[model samples]
Target: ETDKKGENAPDTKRIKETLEKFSLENMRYVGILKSGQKVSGFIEAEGYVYTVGVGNYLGQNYGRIESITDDSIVLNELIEDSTGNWVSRKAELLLNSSDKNTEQAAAPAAEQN
Candidate 1:
C-alpha cells in the first residue's frame, strides 16, 4: 500500500523481507552480463552487511540500517546504465518467486541486419 503521508514511502512488510535476506557483503550497483552479474559494493541491509544476489536490483541494493519495521522498511530499487552507473530509485513490491527459470527476464528478440 502506498503511504497516505508519502505516496512514495516504502511499505513495512517489504522492508522486513529485505532485511531478512541481507547478506554480509551488502552488494550494490549490480549489472547484467553475459557470464553472470557484477556489483559495486554491498549494502548494510537490516543490521548486517549482505551480498545482493544475482537477481537483486542492479542499482543500489539495500543496505543495513539501524532499524527496520512494518512501518519503516523500504525496498530500494536501482537501475544501471550501459556503462554500469547506478541510479537509486524508490521501489514498489513486485511478485517474485525462488524458481530461477521463472525469475529471469525474457531474452532479447532476434536482431535483423
Candidate 2:
C-alpha cells in the first residue's frame, strides 16, 4: 500500500505540465545504430521512426540524449523540484517495440519442442 495523501509528494500540478511539454515520453524506443556515434531509434507521436544521437535536444525542458546503448537510451532533463525549482534529472528509454513480439514468436517455437 502507498500513501494517497499529499504528505510528501512533489507538486502534482507540475506533473501534468511536464507530461504535456515532454511529449517525447510517448516515443517508443525500438532500435539502435552503432556507427561512429551511438544512435537510437524511436517511434514518434504517430509511429514515425526517428533517430537521435548524444546531445540531441528533444524539447526546451524535455531533455537531451545523454547516452545510448544497444537496447536503451539515457536522457538528462530539468524537472520540477519539491520547492518548485527546476532540477537536473536523468531519464531512460528502453526498446519497448519488439519485446512482446519476440516473446510471442519464442512461445510458439517452444511449444513445438
Candidate 3:
C-alpha cells in the first residue's frame, strides 16, 4: 500500500557483497617489478601478500593502478575536492625498505600520445 508520504516503503533491491573479498585496505607496499617488460607491485595486509599489476584495482575506494615503478605503486583514486565534486586524484603506494625512506609520490596526469 502507498503511504501518504511514501515513508513506509520496503527495500526492493538487495546488494550482495562478497564475504571473502580481497582488499587493499591497510595494505603496505613491499616490493616491485620495475622491468621494461613488465611493471608490477606487491602489497601486504593481514599477513597476506598481494600482487598489483598495471591496470589493477586497489582498495575499497576503487583506486586504479596507473603504473608501477621501482620505488612506488602509482594509482588513481576518486576523491571529493573542495567544490564537493568527485574528482580523480593521483596517489601512490611506496615500497617499504629499511635502507631508504619510501616516498608517497603522486601519479602524474595521463599523457597523450
Candidate 4:
C-alpha cells in the first residue's frame, strides 16, 4: 500500500485564508446613479461609501461589476473549483433600504432639538 501526500500541489489553504475586509460580506449596496452615458453604483462599508462602475473589482473572490441597475448591481466572480480550475459565478448586490429609512427618520429628530 502506498500513501502519497501531494506536497507539490497548489496551496489552496493559503489562497482561501487570505480573506480581505473589503469583501461582499462587509459591503452593502446603497444606491445607483447614471450620468448621460456613465453609470455608477454606491457601496457602503464600515460607515464609508465607495463609488463603483462597470469593470470595477470588489470582494475577495475577484468579483467584477458587470452591470448596475435601479435596484441591483450584478457581479461576475471568479471562484476556484474543486479541481483547481477558475469558474465564473454570478453574484448580485441589491439596494439597501434600511439605511435610507434610518436617514429619513434621523433628519426630523435632529431638527426638533
TM-score, candidate 3, is 0.53
- Highest lDDT: which candidate? 4
* TM-score of every candidate: 0.20, 0.52, 0.53, 0.57
> Model 1 — which ten-residue stretch has the worst lDDT?
64-73
Worst 10 residues of 4 by lDDT: 101-110
TM-score of structure candidate 1: 0.20
Q: What is the lDDT of residue 110 in candidate 4?
A: 42
Off by over 4 Å in 4: 1-20, 33-36, 99-113
| lDDT by residue for model 1 (1-113), tens | 65457565535645445454554234332221232433222334444444333344322343222222222223445445575764555543222224356565669687578
User: For residues 1-94, what per-residue lDDT tens digits would candidate 2 score against the true structure?
Assistant: 7756757554554543322443555556667755574455443543555566777654335567878776778888776679787787787877
Better of 1 and 2 by lDDT: 2
**Candidate 4 local Cα displacement, residue 5, angstroms:** 33
Best by TM-score: 4
Model 4 per-residue lDDT tens digits across residues 10-85: 5543453223445657777877666679778877666667667888766566677878887788888787899687
Ranking by TM-score: 4, 3, 2, 1
Look at candidate 3 and give me any clashing residue pairs. Answer: none
- Per-residue error (Å), model 4, residue 108: 31
Stretches of candidate 3 exceeding 4 Å from the true structure: 1-25, 33-36, 79-86, 100-113
| Candidate 2 CA-lDDT value | 0.61
